């Protein structure tokens, strides 16, 4: 326009208010293209995310907007920092796309999953992680997509969550579109199209912590359906009570699978894979495993909770109300958007929600 300017990013264009000078791509995602840059003003590198198809349709919107609001409305030492949100076009008419700006962390949790660690560090990172989750949760908001590529860290040993596109509240009914929530970390209730509650997020933190110990992915499916086969082979077939909770159709297939005993957590996770247990109590392989086996549980009903997790013998070693009990973020109630408003009506809420902030 005159203060903005496009650059050559991937097979696409990038228009950012000049102050954001020095664009280096770093994130290719169904979420949007993301690259780091140096803010000439803030004088510190930042992260620019371009909303890949904001109004490509009814869903993109409901999420484009869902993130904006949630980036804004939520402040916590462990939830990514919102620094801005600008747009190039000038009129609602021309309103084409929106770029968000959030602080920039050093590396990824993938990067972490590629290095040994010690009880102290691993323990703490899972803490910080459970902290940012207690936050979203404490206000009825669910992330539903906690994979490593959505967790960022730093040389000072800190962690912050990311992408809130899928972030929403209460699954009044099965995730009709889990197609999005990444396979490897999909939760049973999501796989078997049930209905998700708060703790679904805790299942993810299960796979995630398991991946940090194994150094490889836990439930390596080869397709949306084979995913179940890896969950049962390790953890074992679900009791009948659970099977009575499945929709009449999923039930059959699920009960027609071979039966699986499953291995115990002292097998899936042998000591040798856990940090060098030192003489001390709080931080021990055994407790690391106990927490693990309380998240990696098919039945949500019987699955741990963030408050409980934040209170476990391996996490509670650095508890502090100022982080674990922190005040829930307050939404103006904008999430009224369950009501799928038309693309246009959508583009209304969007561009403007964009606007002012």
């Amino acid at each position: 326009d005159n203060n903005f300017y496009s650059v050559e990013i991937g097979d696409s264009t990038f228009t950012v208010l000049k102050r954001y000078q020095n664009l280096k791509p770093i994130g290719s995602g169904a979420q949007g293209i993301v690259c780091a840059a140096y803010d000439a003003i803030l004088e510190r590198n930042v992260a620019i995310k371009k909303l890949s198809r904001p109004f490509q349709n009814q869903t993109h919107a409901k999420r484009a907007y869902r993130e904006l609001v949630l980036m804004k409305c939520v402040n916590h030492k462990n939830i990514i920092g919102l620094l801005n949100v600008f747009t190039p076009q000038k009129s609602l008419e021309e309103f084409q796309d929106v770029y968000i700006v959030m602080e920039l962390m050093d590396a990824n949790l993938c990067q972490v999953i590629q290095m040994e660690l010690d009880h102290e560090r691993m323990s703490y990172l899972l803490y910080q992680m459970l902290c940012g989750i207690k936050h979203l949760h404490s206000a009825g908001i669910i992330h539903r997509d906690l994979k490593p590529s959505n967790i960022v860290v730093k040389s000072d040993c800190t962690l912050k969550i990311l992408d809130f596109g899928l972030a929403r509240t209460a699954g009044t009914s099965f995730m009709m579109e889990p197609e999005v929530v990444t396979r490897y970390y999909r939760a049973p209730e999501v796989i078997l199209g049930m209905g998700y509650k708060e703790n679904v997020d805790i299942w993810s933190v299960g796979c995630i912590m398991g991946e940090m110990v194994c150094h490889k992915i836990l439930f390596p499916g080869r397709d949306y359906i084979d995913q179940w086969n890896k969950v049962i082979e390790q953890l074992g077939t679900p009791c009948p009570a659970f099977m009575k909770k499945l929709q009449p159709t999923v039930r059959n297939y699920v009960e027609n699978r071979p039966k699986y005993a499953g291995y115990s957590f002292e097998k899936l996770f042998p000591d040798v894979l856990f940090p060098a247990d030192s003489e001390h109590n709080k931080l021990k392989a055994s407790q690391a495993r106990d927490l693990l086996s309380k998240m990696l549980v098919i039945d949500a009903s019987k699955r741990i909770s963030v408050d409980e997790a934040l209170q476990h013998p391996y996490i509670n070693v650095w508890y502090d109300p100022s982080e674990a009990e922190a005040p829930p973020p307050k939404i103006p109630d904008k999430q009224l958007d369950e009501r799928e408003h038309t693309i246009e009506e959508w583009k209304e809420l969007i561009y403007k929600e964009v606007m002012d902030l």
Binding site: D106, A107, Q111, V112, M115, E120, R121, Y124, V153, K154, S155, D156, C157, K282, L283, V317, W318
Partner: peptide
């Protein structure tokens, strides 16, 4: 039992 301060990611 203090919180870590460094995380060699490099």
């Amino acid at each position: 039992p203090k919180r870590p301060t460094t995380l060699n990611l490099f």
